[PDB]
CSV table of C-alpha atoms in Angstrom, one decimal:
chain,number,residue,atom,x,y,z
A,1,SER,CA,112.2,78.7,116.6
A,2,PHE,CA,108.7,79.3,115.1
A,3,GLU,CA,107.2,75.8,115.9
A,4,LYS,CA,104.0,77.3,117.3
A,5,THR,CA,103.4,79.1,114.0
A,6,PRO,CA,103.8,76.7,111.1
A,7,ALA,CA,103.5,78.4,107.7
A,8,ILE,CA,99.9,78.9,106.5
A,9,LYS,CA,99.2,77.9,102.9
A,10,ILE,CA,96.4,78.5,100.5
A,11,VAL,CA,94.5,75.7,98.8
A,12,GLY,CA,91.5,76.7,96.7
A,13,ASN,CA,89.6,79.4,98.6
A,14,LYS,CA,90.7,78.4,102.1
A,15,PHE,CA,93.8,78.8,104.4
A,16,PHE,CA,95.4,75.7,105.9
A,17,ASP,CA,98.0,75.0,108.6
A,18,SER,CA,100.7,73.4,106.4
A,19,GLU,CA,101.8,70.9,109.2
A,20,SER,CA,98.4,70.0,110.9
A,21,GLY,CA,96.2,70.1,107.8
A,22,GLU,CA,93.5,72.0,109.7
A,23,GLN,CA,91.7,75.0,108.1
A,24,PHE,CA,93.1,78.3,109.4
A,25,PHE,CA,90.6,81.1,110.4
A,26,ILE,CA,91.8,84.6,111.1
A,27,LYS,CA,90.9,86.0,114.5
A,28,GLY,CA,92.7,89.2,114.2
A,29,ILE,CA,93.2,92.8,115.1
A,30,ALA,CA,94.9,95.8,113.4
A,31,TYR,CA,98.1,96.8,115.2
A,32,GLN,CA,99.6,100.1,114.0
A,33,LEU,CA,100.8,103.1,116.1
A,34,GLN,CA,100.2,106.4,114.3
A,35,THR,CA,110.1,107.0,108.9
A,36,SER,CA,106.9,109.1,109.7
A,37,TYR,CA,105.1,105.9,110.5
A,38,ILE,CA,106.0,104.1,113.6
A,39,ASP,CA,107.2,100.4,113.3
A,40,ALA,CA,106.3,98.9,116.7
A,41,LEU,CA,107.4,95.4,115.4
A,42,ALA,CA,111.0,97.0,115.2
A,43,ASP,CA,110.8,98.2,118.8
A,44,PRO,CA,110.9,95.4,121.5
A,45,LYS,CA,109.8,97.6,124.3
A,46,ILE,CA,106.5,98.4,122.5
A,47,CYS,CA,105.7,95.0,121.0
A,48,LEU,CA,106.6,93.0,124.2
A,49,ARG,CA,104.4,95.4,126.2
A,50,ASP,CA,101.4,94.8,123.9
A,51,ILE,CA,101.7,91.0,123.1
A,52,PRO,CA,100.5,89.9,126.5
A,53,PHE,CA,97.4,92.1,126.0
A,54,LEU,CA,97.0,90.6,122.5
A,55,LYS,CA,97.3,87.1,124.0
A,56,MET,CA,94.5,87.9,126.5
A,57,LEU,CA,92.4,89.2,123.7
A,58,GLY,CA,92.7,85.8,122.0
A,59,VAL,CA,93.9,86.9,118.5
A,60,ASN,CA,96.0,84.7,116.2
A,61,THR,CA,96.7,87.4,113.6
A,62,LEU,CA,97.8,91.1,113.5
A,63,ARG,CA,97.4,93.4,110.6
A,64,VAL,CA,100.3,95.8,110.3
A,65,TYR,CA,100.1,98.7,107.7
A,66,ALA,CA,103.8,99.8,107.7
A,67,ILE,CA,107.2,98.4,108.7
A,68,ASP,CA,110.6,100.0,108.3
A,69,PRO,CA,112.6,97.5,106.2
A,70,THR,CA,116.0,99.0,107.3
A,71,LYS,CA,115.3,97.7,110.9
A,72,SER,CA,115.4,94.2,112.4
A,73,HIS,CA,112.1,92.5,113.3
A,74,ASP,CA,113.1,89.0,114.6
A,75,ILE,CA,112.6,89.8,118.3
A,76,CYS,CA,109.0,90.9,117.9
A,77,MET,CA,108.3,88.3,115.2
A,78,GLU,CA,109.7,85.5,117.4
A,79,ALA,CA,107.7,86.9,120.4
A,80,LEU,CA,104.5,86.8,118.3
A,81,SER,CA,105.3,83.2,117.1
A,82,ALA,CA,105.7,82.1,120.8
A,83,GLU,CA,102.0,83.0,121.3
A,84,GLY,CA,100.7,81.5,118.0
A,85,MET,CA,100.3,84.9,116.3
A,86,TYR,CA,100.7,85.6,112.5
A,87,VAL,CA,101.1,88.9,110.6
A,88,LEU,CA,99.3,90.3,107.5
A,89,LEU,CA,101.5,93.1,106.2
A,90,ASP,CA,100.9,96.0,103.8
A,91,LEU,CA,103.9,96.5,101.5
A,92,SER,CA,103.4,100.3,101.1
A,93,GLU,CA,103.9,103.2,103.5
A,94,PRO,CA,102.0,106.5,103.7
A,95,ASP,CA,104.5,108.4,101.4
A,96,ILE,CA,105.3,105.5,99.0
A,97,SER,CA,101.9,104.2,97.7
A,98,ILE,CA,100.0,103.9,94.5
A,99,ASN,CA,98.2,107.3,94.5
A,100,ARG,CA,94.5,106.7,93.6
A,101,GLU,CA,94.2,110.2,92.0
A,102,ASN,CA,97.3,110.0,89.9
A,103,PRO,CA,98.1,106.3,89.7
A,104,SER,CA,101.6,105.0,88.8
A,105,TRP,CA,103.5,101.8,89.1
A,106,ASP,CA,107.1,102.8,89.1
A,107,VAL,CA,110.6,102.1,90.3
A,108,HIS,CA,110.3,104.0,93.6
A,109,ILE,CA,107.1,102.1,94.7
A,110,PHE,CA,108.4,98.8,93.4
A,111,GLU,CA,111.7,99.2,95.4
A,112,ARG,CA,109.7,99.9,98.6
A,113,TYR,CA,107.7,96.7,98.0
A,114,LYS,CA,110.9,94.7,97.4
A,115,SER,CA,112.6,96.0,100.5
A,116,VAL,CA,109.6,95.0,102.6
A,117,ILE,CA,109.6,91.6,101.0
A,118,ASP,CA,113.4,91.3,101.7
A,119,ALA,CA,112.9,92.4,105.4
A,120,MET,CA,110.0,90.0,106.3
A,121,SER,CA,109.9,86.9,104.1
A,122,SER,CA,112.1,84.6,106.3
A,123,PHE,CA,109.4,84.6,109.1
A,124,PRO,CA,107.1,81.5,108.9
A,125,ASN,CA,104.4,83.5,110.8
A,126,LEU,CA,104.2,86.1,107.9
A,127,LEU,CA,100.7,85.1,106.7
A,128,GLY,CA,100.5,87.3,103.6
A,129,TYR,CA,101.3,90.6,102.0
A,130,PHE,CA,98.8,93.3,100.8
A,131,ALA,CA,99.9,94.9,97.5
A,132,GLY,CA,97.2,97.5,98.0
A,133,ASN,CA,94.7,99.0,100.5
A,134,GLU,CA,91.6,100.8,99.2
A,135,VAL,CA,93.4,102.3,96.1
A,136,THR,CA,90.3,102.4,94.0
A,137,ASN,CA,87.6,103.5,96.5
A,138,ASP,CA,84.7,104.7,94.2
A,139,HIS,CA,83.5,104.9,90.6
A,140,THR,CA,85.8,107.9,89.8
A,141,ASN,CA,89.1,106.1,90.3
A,142,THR,CA,88.7,102.5,89.1
A,143,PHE,CA,91.5,103.1,86.6
A,144,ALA,CA,93.9,102.9,89.6
A,145,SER,CA,93.3,99.1,89.9
A,146,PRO,CA,95.4,98.0,86.9
A,147,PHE,CA,98.4,99.6,88.7
A,148,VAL,CA,97.6,97.4,91.8
A,149,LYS,CA,97.2,94.3,89.6
A,150,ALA,CA,100.7,95.0,88.2
A,151,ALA,CA,102.0,95.4,91.7
A,152,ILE,CA,100.5,92.0,92.7
A,153,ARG,CA,102.1,90.4,89.6
A,154,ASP,CA,105.5,92.0,90.2
A,155,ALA,CA,105.5,91.3,93.9
A,156,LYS,CA,104.6,87.6,93.3
A,157,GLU,CA,107.3,87.5,90.5
A,158,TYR,CA,110.0,88.9,92.9
A,159,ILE,CA,108.9,86.4,95.7
A,160,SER,CA,108.8,83.6,93.1
A,161,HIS,CA,112.3,84.2,91.6
A,162,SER,CA,113.9,84.3,95.1
A,163,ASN,CA,115.0,82.0,97.9
A,164,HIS,CA,111.9,82.7,100.1
A,165,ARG,CA,108.8,80.7,100.9
A,166,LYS,CA,106.1,81.7,98.4
A,167,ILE,CA,104.2,84.0,100.7
A,168,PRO,CA,100.8,84.9,99.2
A,169,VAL,CA,100.1,88.4,97.9
A,170,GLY,CA,96.6,89.9,98.1
A,171,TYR,CA,94.5,93.0,98.2
A,172,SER,CA,92.5,94.9,100.7
A,173,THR,CA,89.3,96.8,99.5
A,174,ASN,CA,86.6,99.2,100.8
A,175,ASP,CA,82.9,98.6,100.7
A,176,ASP,CA,81.4,101.0,98.0
A,177,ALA,CA,78.4,99.3,96.5
A,178,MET,CA,78.8,100.6,93.0
A,179,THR,CA,82.4,99.2,92.7
A,180,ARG,CA,82.6,96.2,95.0
A,181,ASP,CA,81.4,93.5,92.6
A,182,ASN,CA,83.6,94.7,89.8
A,183,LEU,CA,86.6,95.0,92.1
A,184,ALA,CA,86.1,91.5,93.4
A,185,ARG,CA,85.9,90.1,89.8
A,186,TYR,CA,88.8,92.3,88.5
A,187,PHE,CA,91.2,90.9,91.1
A,188,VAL,CA,90.6,87.3,90.1
A,189,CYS,CA,90.3,87.9,86.3
A,190,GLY,CA,92.7,87.4,83.4
A,191,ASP,CA,96.3,86.1,83.9
A,192,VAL,CA,97.0,88.1,87.1
A,193,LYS,CA,95.2,87.2,90.3
A,194,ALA,CA,95.3,88.3,93.9
A,195,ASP,CA,96.1,85.3,96.2
A,196,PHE,CA,93.6,86.4,98.8
A,197,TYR,CA,91.0,89.2,99.3
A,198,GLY,CA,90.2,91.3,102.4
A,199,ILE,CA,87.2,93.7,102.8
A,200,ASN,CA,87.2,96.5,105.2
A,201,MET,CA,83.8,95.7,106.4
A,202,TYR,CA,81.9,98.1,108.7
A,203,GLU,CA,78.2,97.2,107.6
A,204,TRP,CA,77.3,95.7,111.1
A,205,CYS,CA,76.8,98.6,113.5
A,206,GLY,CA,75.8,98.1,117.1
A,207,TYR,CA,73.2,95.4,117.9
A,208,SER,CA,72.6,94.4,114.3
A,209,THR,CA,71.7,91.0,112.7
A,210,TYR,CA,73.0,88.7,110.0
A,211,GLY,CA,69.8,89.4,107.9
A,212,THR,CA,69.6,93.2,108.5
A,213,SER,CA,73.3,94.1,108.4
A,214,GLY,CA,74.1,93.2,104.8
A,215,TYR,CA,76.3,90.3,106.0
A,216,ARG,CA,73.9,87.7,104.5
A,217,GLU,CA,73.9,89.4,101.1
A,218,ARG,CA,77.8,89.8,101.2
A,219,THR,CA,78.1,86.1,102.1
A,220,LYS,CA,75.9,85.0,99.3
A,221,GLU,CA,77.8,87.1,96.7
A,222,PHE,CA,81.2,85.8,97.8
A,223,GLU,CA,80.1,82.2,98.0
A,224,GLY,CA,82.3,80.2,95.5
A,225,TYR,CA,84.7,83.1,95.1
A,226,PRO,CA,88.0,81.3,94.0
A,227,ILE,CA,90.4,82.7,96.6
A,228,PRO,CA,90.3,83.1,100.4
A,229,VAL,CA,88.2,86.0,101.5
A,230,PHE,CA,87.9,87.7,104.9
A,231,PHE,CA,87.3,90.9,106.8
A,232,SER,CA,90.6,92.8,106.6
A,233,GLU,CA,88.9,95.3,109.1
A,234,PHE,CA,85.7,95.3,111.1
A,235,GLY,CA,84.2,97.1,114.2
A,236,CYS,CA,81.7,99.9,113.4
A,237,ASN,CA,81.6,102.4,116.3
A,238,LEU,CA,77.9,103.5,116.2
A,239,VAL,CA,77.2,102.3,119.8
A,240,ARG,CA,79.9,102.3,122.5
A,241,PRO,CA,81.2,100.2,124.0
A,242,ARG,CA,81.2,98.3,120.7
A,243,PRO,CA,79.2,95.1,121.3
A,244,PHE,CA,81.2,93.1,118.6
A,245,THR,CA,78.1,90.8,118.0
A,246,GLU,CA,79.2,90.6,114.4
A,247,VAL,CA,81.8,88.1,115.6
A,248,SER,CA,79.2,85.5,116.4
A,249,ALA,CA,77.9,85.8,112.8
A,250,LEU,CA,81.3,85.8,111.2
A,251,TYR,CA,82.4,82.5,112.8
A,252,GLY,CA,79.0,80.8,112.7
A,253,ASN,CA,78.3,77.8,110.3
A,254,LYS,CA,76.8,80.0,107.6
A,255,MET,CA,79.6,82.5,107.3
A,256,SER,CA,82.5,80.2,108.2
A,257,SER,CA,81.9,78.2,105.0
A,258,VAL,CA,82.6,81.4,102.9
A,259,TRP,CA,84.7,83.7,105.1
A,260,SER,CA,88.2,82.9,106.6
A,261,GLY,CA,87.5,85.2,109.6
A,262,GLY,CA,88.6,88.7,110.1
A,263,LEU,CA,90.6,91.4,111.9
A,264,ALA,CA,89.0,94.0,114.3
A,265,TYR,CA,90.0,97.6,113.8
A,266,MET,CA,92.0,98.3,116.0
A,267,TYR,CA,94.4,97.8,119.0
A,268,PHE,CA,95.4,101.4,119.8
A,269,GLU,CA,92.9,104.1,120.6
A,270,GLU,CA,93.9,107.1,118.4
A,271,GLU,CA,91.3,110.0,118.6
A,272,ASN,CA,89.0,108.0,116.2
A,273,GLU,CA,87.5,105.8,119.0
A,274,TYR,CA,88.5,102.5,117.4
A,275,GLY,CA,90.9,101.3,120.2
A,276,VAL,CA,90.6,98.4,122.6
A,277,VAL,CA,93.4,99.9,124.7
A,278,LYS,CA,94.7,103.4,125.4
A,279,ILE,CA,98.3,104.1,125.9
A,280,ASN,CA,98.7,106.3,129.1
A,281,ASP,CA,101.4,109.0,129.6
A,282,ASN,CA,103.5,106.4,131.4
A,283,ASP,CA,103.4,104.5,128.1
A,284,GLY,CA,101.4,101.7,129.9
A,285,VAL,CA,98.3,99.9,128.5
A,286,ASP,CA,94.8,100.9,129.8
A,287,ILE,CA,92.2,98.3,128.8
A,288,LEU,CA,89.1,100.0,127.4
A,289,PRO,CA,85.5,98.6,127.7
A,290,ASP,CA,85.7,97.4,124.0
A,291,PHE,CA,88.5,95.0,124.9
A,292,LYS,CA,86.3,92.8,127.1
A,293,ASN,CA,83.5,92.6,124.5
A,294,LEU,CA,85.9,91.6,121.8
A,295,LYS,CA,87.7,89.1,124.1
A,296,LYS,CA,84.4,87.4,125.1
A,297,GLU,CA,83.2,87.2,121.5
A,298,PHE,CA,86.5,85.7,120.1
A,299,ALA,CA,86.5,83.2,123.0
A,300,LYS,CA,83.0,81.9,122.1
A,301,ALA,CA,83.8,81.8,118.4
A,302,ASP,CA,84.5,78.3,117.3
A,303,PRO,CA,84.5,78.1,113.4
A,304,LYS,CA,83.6,74.7,111.9
A,305,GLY,CA,86.3,74.2,109.3
A,306,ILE,CA,87.5,71.3,107.1
A,307,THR,CA,90.8,69.4,106.9
A,308,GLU,CA,93.0,69.9,103.9
A,309,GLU,CA,92.8,66.2,103.2
A,310,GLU,CA,89.0,66.3,103.1
A,311,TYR,CA,88.8,69.6,101.0
A,312,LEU,CA,91.0,68.1,98.3
A,313,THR,CA,88.1,65.6,97.6
A,314,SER,CA,90.5,82.1,84.0
A,315,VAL,CA,87.5,84.4,84.6
A,316,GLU,CA,86.3,87.3,82.4
A,317,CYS,CA,87.2,90.8,83.5
A,318,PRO,CA,84.4,93.3,83.9
A,319,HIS,CA,83.5,95.2,80.7
A,320,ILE,CA,84.5,98.8,80.5
A,321,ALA,CA,81.6,101.2,81.2
A,322,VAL,CA,82.3,104.9,81.3
A,323,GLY,CA,81.6,106.5,84.7
A,324,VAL,CA,81.2,103.0,86.4
A,325,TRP,CA,84.1,100.7,85.6
A,326,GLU,CA,87.3,101.9,83.8
A,327,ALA,CA,90.0,99.4,84.7
A,328,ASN,CA,91.8,98.1,81.6
A,329,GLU,CA,92.8,94.4,81.5
A,330,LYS,CA,96.2,95.6,79.9
A,331,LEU,CA,98.5,96.3,82.9
A,332,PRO,CA,101.6,98.5,83.1
A,333,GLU,CA,104.8,96.7,82.6
A,334,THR,CA,107.3,95.7,85.4
A,335,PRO,CA,109.2,98.9,86.3
A,336,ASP,CA,112.8,98.9,84.9
A,337,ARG,CA,115.3,100.3,87.5
A,338,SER,CA,118.3,100.1,85.1
A,339,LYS,CA,116.5,101.9,82.2
A,340,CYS,CA,115.3,104.7,84.5
A,341,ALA,CA,118.7,104.9,86.2
A,342,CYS,CA,120.1,105.8,82.7
A,343,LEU,CA,118.1,109.1,82.8
A,344,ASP,CA,120.2,110.1,85.8
A,345,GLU,CA,123.4,109.8,83.8
A,346,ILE,CA,122.3,111.2,80.4
A,347,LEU,CA,119.7,114.0,81.0
A,348,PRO,CA,121.1,117.5,80.8
A,349,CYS,CA,118.6,119.0,83.3
A,350,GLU,CA,117.7,117.3,86.6
A,351,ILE,CA,115.5,118.2,89.5
A,352,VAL,CA,115.9,117.1,93.1
A,353,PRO,CA,112.8,115.7,94.8
A,354,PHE,CA,110.2,118.0,96.3
A,355,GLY,CA,102.2,121.1,94.8
A,356,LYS,CA,105.2,121.9,92.5
A,357,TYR,CA,104.9,118.6,90.6
A,358,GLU,CA,101.3,119.3,89.4
A,359,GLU,CA,102.4,123.0,88.6
A,360,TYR,CA,105.6,122.0,86.9
A,361,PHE,CA,104.0,119.1,84.9
A,362,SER,CA,101.2,121.5,83.7
A,363,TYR,CA,103.8,124.0,82.6
A,364,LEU,CA,106.3,121.6,80.9
A,365,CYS,CA,103.6,119.5,79.3
A,366,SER,CA,102.1,122.6,77.5
A,367,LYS,CA,105.6,123.2,75.9
A,368,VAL,CA,106.6,119.5,75.2
A,369,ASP,CA,104.8,116.2,74.5
A,370,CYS,CA,104.5,114.3,77.8
A,371,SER,CA,103.1,111.1,76.3
A,372,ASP,CA,106.3,109.2,77.1
A,373,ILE,CA,105.6,109.6,80.9
A,374,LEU,CA,101.8,109.3,81.0
A,375,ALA,CA,100.2,106.1,82.3
A,376,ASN,CA,96.5,105.5,81.5
A,377,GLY,CA,94.7,102.7,83.3
A,378,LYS,CA,91.5,103.3,81.3
A,379,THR,CA,92.9,102.7,77.9
A,380,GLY,CA,95.9,100.6,78.9
A,381,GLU,CA,98.4,103.0,77.2
A,382,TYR,CA,101.6,103.4,79.2
A,383,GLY,CA,104.4,105.7,78.0
A,384,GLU,CA,107.9,104.4,77.6
A,385,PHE,CA,109.2,106.2,80.7
A,386,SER,CA,105.9,106.0,82.7
A,387,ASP,CA,107.6,103.5,85.1
A,388,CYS,CA,110.3,106.0,86.2
A,389,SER,CA,110.3,108.1,89.4
A,390,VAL,CA,108.2,111.1,89.8
A,391,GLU,CA,111.7,113.3,89.6
A,392,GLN,CA,113.1,111.4,86.5
A,393,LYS,CA,109.8,112.0,84.7
A,394,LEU,CA,109.9,115.7,85.4
A,395,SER,CA,113.7,115.8,84.6
A,396,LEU,CA,112.9,114.2,81.2
A,397,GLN,CA,110.4,116.9,80.2
A,398,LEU,CA,112.6,119.8,81.4
A,399,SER,CA,115.6,118.3,79.5
A,400,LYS,CA,113.3,118.0,76.4
A,401,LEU,CA,112.5,121.7,76.6
A,402,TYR,CA,116.2,122.6,77.1
A,403,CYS,CA,117.1,120.7,73.9
A,404,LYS,CA,114.1,122.1,72.0
A,405,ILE,CA,115.1,125.7,72.9
A,406,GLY,CA,118.6,124.8,71.6
A,407,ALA,CA,120.6,127.5,73.4
A,408,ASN,CA,123.1,124.9,74.7
A,409,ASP,CA,124.3,127.3,77.5
A,410,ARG,CA,123.7,125.0,80.6
A,411,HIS,CA,120.7,127.2,81.6
A,412,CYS,CA,117.9,124.8,82.4
A,413,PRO,CA,114.6,126.5,81.3
A,414,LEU,CA,112.7,126.5,84.7
A,415,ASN,CA,113.4,128.9,87.5
A,416,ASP,CA,113.5,126.8,90.7
A,417,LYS,CA,116.3,126.0,93.2
A,418,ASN,CA,115.8,122.2,92.8
A,419,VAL,CA,116.6,122.5,89.1
A,420,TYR,CA,120.3,122.0,88.2
A,421,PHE,CA,122.5,121.2,85.2
A,422,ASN,CA,123.6,117.6,85.3
A,423,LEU,CA,127.4,117.6,84.6
A,424,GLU,CA,127.3,113.7,84.2
A,425,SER,CA,125.4,114.3,80.9
A,426,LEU,CA,128.7,115.5,79.4
A,427,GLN,CA,130.3,112.1,79.9
A,428,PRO,CA,130.4,109.5,77.0
A,429,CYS,CA,124.9,102.3,81.3
A,430,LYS,CA,123.1,102.1,77.9
A,431,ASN,CA,123.2,103.9,74.6
A,432,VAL,CA,119.7,102.3,74.3
A,433,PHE,CA,118.8,105.8,75.8
A,434,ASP,CA,115.9,107.7,74.4
């Protein structure tokens, strides 16, 4: 039973408890142990150790960056519900993410997102999904953001055309001044919109103020923004112990009318000095001085919200400007698993997954036309097979060189142990093919 955590819903630019009608404010902390990620919410001994410490801290929300969808989460998710706690969840993992330097929206990443959605959507205390975290981070990689918008669209589509509660799908961004307005506008522009928007906000350092930190200016620029907005991370570590005086500002009357709260970064201490606890060699919890300051600030924080009943009584995309903003409004298409699966059956020359990609793409794309696998977020040109996996794309180009050479001897023209002749290509899915 999840009675202590009714589903939160979005109306306009605010969160609301769907059963009480009261506005929901996030008082959170990031909770991530550093598969090749660790999924503490799949390990009862870890989460049941930490939840009593989370309870003392006074949080109602965790941010989790990676779960293993092949594992069960009901024990930890029920234990969290018992203490009134919700989860914001990233859909990616470290090795399956939109790469900001070479962005793609493809079958491999989309399948990861779906699996996470399938693993976690039955939990009423799943607050929301992040389709991206700081993908575009400065003016040289804004062309990554159309790939993220496509991911939001396709994630929302897949949630929509399914049996699940319509869990909102949003985005988490950094705080680079040259890109931040454009990013905010881009994610609510056109036909595809994020459902909510978190900022990783570290502008308030030590004993700062509302007027000197930048918080006032941020608050004024997000006032009237059409979707819920909050601090997906906060807790600058200039001075230590961290005072967390930003918490008083965040949940004060001025900021609580714009921001839906925030999540401190983070629970575990991990060589970066951001923890509120340290895990000892016994695997027990040692409370750090930060914990008490955060605890005391969250306890004082009493945001003045509005009831849903009371609250009840598309925008232009940024222009393209070279060097500054280069995110095309035209998005890549929904990746097609069945179409890309056909390459595995028909292609003469295949390569098993691996530095070598960049090397082997440079090589093959000098000998054959690679337009069919390129994805360009600046111009909105996406090749026919640009949604396929990193290996299928490479296999296609190698197979193209093989046929162009014409030898027809089953010698694939690239010397590498991962290259092999595909015997399935001699057999008679879809003749739609190339």
